[PDB]
Amino acid sequence: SAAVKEFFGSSQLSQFMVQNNPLSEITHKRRISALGPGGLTRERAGFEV
DNA sequence: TGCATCCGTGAGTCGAGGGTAATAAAAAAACATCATGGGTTGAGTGTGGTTATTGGGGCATAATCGATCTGTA
Questions:
Q1: Within 7 Å: CB of A43 and strand B?
Q2: Is residue A8's beta carbon less than 7 angstroms from any atom in nucleic acid strand B?
Q3: How many CA atoms does the CB half-sphere of A5 hold within 13 Å?
């Protein structure tokens, strides 16, 4: 339960869901990110990615 | 001299939630320490008490009107 709770809420890929519009809802749930565990960082990422 | 190796660097205001957790032993004795409760100091705040009065009203001792029967050309 500790590990699953840390992933659900304390991880980078789980963040508060935007609720301004239904469009914001859809475009936040249909989102692809290249960060988080095993991914790049904004400082590290160059140009090709 | 060439080689790998290590060591700093790299923006700017801003917002919103904002904290989570793999584990573990009990006895005993011994001692320290605060917590409450009851009793002296002591420290007040509390309350009447005598004696300084200064305006006010008062009674004396004087005073300036108001009203009528006797003396002078």
A1: yes
A2: no
A3: 2
